């Protein structure tokens, strides 16, 4: 049941500095008290990350290209963000991906669906507004897992696609800053591989709409871009990445 | 020593002649837990089948394709394949499995073949010229045979043109054999194409039903989500054996480890990128890899002009894994360790020398 | 139809180079042994050319 939104206010997107955030484990290899240099598609330190807002009256629902891998972070509470969309055309021409988190479980369906111009969710003040897609035709792959969810919890995410292996990475990071990133270091532990092997070029985030007209919550989420480069990751005694260095950042790091 | 030196006389000294290597005892192959079987109960062993022109296509994907139960069942009358080895089905991996089921008579089983021209193939289900997959069939006289008539299972008898490979027709148009103008209305030379079977209790061999469920494989560029079963043998510890930890083959000694692996790490590497710890897949335990006790073998001899006695040094090898002395340079065999101290005659290493008085260390 | 030449379609184990097998015995292609008698999952090792 696709529905247009005629109450949109126009304001440019914000920007911020990625800081020392976005480090993920390159592989599943334990390493202790050794400085491992790896060549892998990483989010560059001190990079330019695009910032989107939701406030009530703004509503940022873009369709950005996946490029070669997208970093995603969300300083969020009350579960405004509850899923993602992946697919080239997102209509009845090419296959898409569906990620929906709700009161039962997370849904990972690899299906060719005809998405709306603005898909969304619903929280009327409990979810009772299931308007994401107006139709459903075919499905080829399907997966089931467990849910992954002043702002307290910032949920980093890194996605990649090498030979169709849709790796998903995340970490639970406590925070206290209402708006900007914290100052510190935290590696991103892997979750699950998704060997789907289809065409992925663009992605889209699903938002949970509130109702008191449609209400909007205080949301702040990020879209980082991964680039191929080299990193120097320092491993602690217990095997976690406690420090990282971007070899192409500045001459001292090189 | 003579053979290594390529001479029949050996001067006094210590010569490395070979390499000691603790050979492996057994080969260990271990893998994660065998779960999430393919639900073939509701596919091959269902209750109600379908007509041959309306075969039910079921997708068997993202499950470990166990073929032993399907292959070794005595209820299946015949197991036939054209392009794949029946006994190699456990070692094969596929993107997906096309599970299709239908019902045909006893003499129609030969028609299920690549390129066969029969009354069923050209109008119900036609195969390509390079088909893959094994066909499973069985006699269903115990259940399909009904005195009142088993007319539920139909078959498309005729159609205007031959079928392309892998085509399903659900239409119910009127066949036109002659030049009479028909507009969906039956007449002298216009009849319904679909007909019933003839499964009756009186009929014997050659006139009996054969339920046929066919598995087909596609091996496109998509990752091999469907694969075969893996065998996880017993686990050995504190022994130099070969091991296979999810493809990480090699030889080494496995012991209990106090290393705290993170909940996603399966392997552990040292500074020089050599695997020195593995998480056991079946039961999550960390096993240190210690290389098997290798080392050079040195033969301590005086000149052959003096004697033929020799002493053997196993460099860097503890004596328990090989007149037996434990020097810091390794295990020494054939030399008696005296408590006296002389000038060094034949150097062993770490302050120990050898001499011929019998060979003493 | 000439059916005077036959090929060893099925064999239990591989052949070494310049080694000939003439053992015209049964192939146990199933879990249940043939017991030396032809039957289900058991055929002649040599198949005539069509
Ligand atoms: C919501 O709005 C969007 C754009 O504002 C609509 O998308 C267009 O709809 C018109 C009307 O059918 C089509 O002619 C265009 O081709 C659509 N655009 C594209 C890019 O395809 C959308 O249909 C609206 N939703 C509903 C339910 O009307
Ligand atoms: C990021 O790029 C945008 C334009 O693409 C620019 O307006 C903004 O100032 C940049 N921010 C930083 C921190 O470089
Ligand atoms: C969560 O989404 C699934 C998607 O099919 C739906 O079946 C389920 O009812 C939803 N949960 C609730 C509480 O409505
Ligand atoms: C997709 O669905 C359409 C109709 O919904 C159907 O005609 C088409 O065959 C389907 N394709 C696949 C690959 O299932
Ligand atoms: C994937 O989609 C992009 C844009 O839609 C297109 O340029 C590309 O050719 C597609 N690749 C494949 C393999 O379909
Ligand atoms: C490593 O583990 C020990 C306990 O074994 C703990 O005291 C210490 O804080 C840990 N260090 C890090 C950096 O997590
Ligand atoms: C039918 O086949 C399935 C395949 O595993 C098996 O589990 C089931 O037991 C079979 N049915 C009967 C009645 O034996
Ligand atoms: C896997 O198999 C082992 C072997 O007994 C068992 O102990 C374990 O509970 C099983 N399950 C998991 C999730 O490891």
Author numbering:
A (entry chain B): 14 to 69, 77 to 145, 153 to 176, 185 to 247, 257 to 298
B (entry chain A): 299 to 620, 641 to 675, 691 to 694
C (entry chain C): 447 to 496
Article passage:
SARS-CoV-2 utilizes a trimeric spike glycoprotein for attachment to the host cell receptor angiotensin-converting enzyme 2 (ACE2) and for the subsequent cell entry step which involves the fusion of host cell and viral membranes. Given its crucial role in the viral replicative cycle, the spike protein represents an important therapeutic target and is a critical antigen in host immune responses. All emerging variants contain defining mutations within their spike proteins, with multiple mutations clustering within the receptor-binding domain (RBD) impacting both ACE2 binding and antibody neutralization escape, while mutations within the highly antigenic loops in the N-terminal domain (NTD) across these variants reduce antibody neutralization. Given the rapidly changing mutational and antigenic landscape of the SARS-CoV-2 spike protein, a structural understanding of spike protein mutational effects and the discovery of broadly neutralizing epitopes is of importance.
To this aim, ectodomains bearing variant spike mutations were used for cryo-EM structural studies. Global 3D reconstructions were obtained at resolutions ranging from (2.25–2.5 Å), yielding open trimers with one RBD in the up conformation and 2 RBDs in the down conformation for all spikes. The resolution within the NTD and RBD was insufficient for accurate visualization of mutational impacts within these domains, due to high degrees of conformational heterogeneity. In contrast, we were able to confidently model sidechains close to, and within the S2 domain, owing to its limited flexibility. Additional mutations were visualized within the Beta and Gamma variant spike proteins, with implications for inter-protomer and intra-protomer contacts. The T1027I mutation lies within the Gamma spike S2 core and the bulky hydrophobic I1027 sidechain faces inwards, increasing the hydrophobicity of the local buried environment. This may decrease the local dielectric constant, enhancing the strength of the nearby network of interprotomer salt bridges between E1031 and R1039 on adjacent protomers and thus stabilize the Gamma variant trimer.
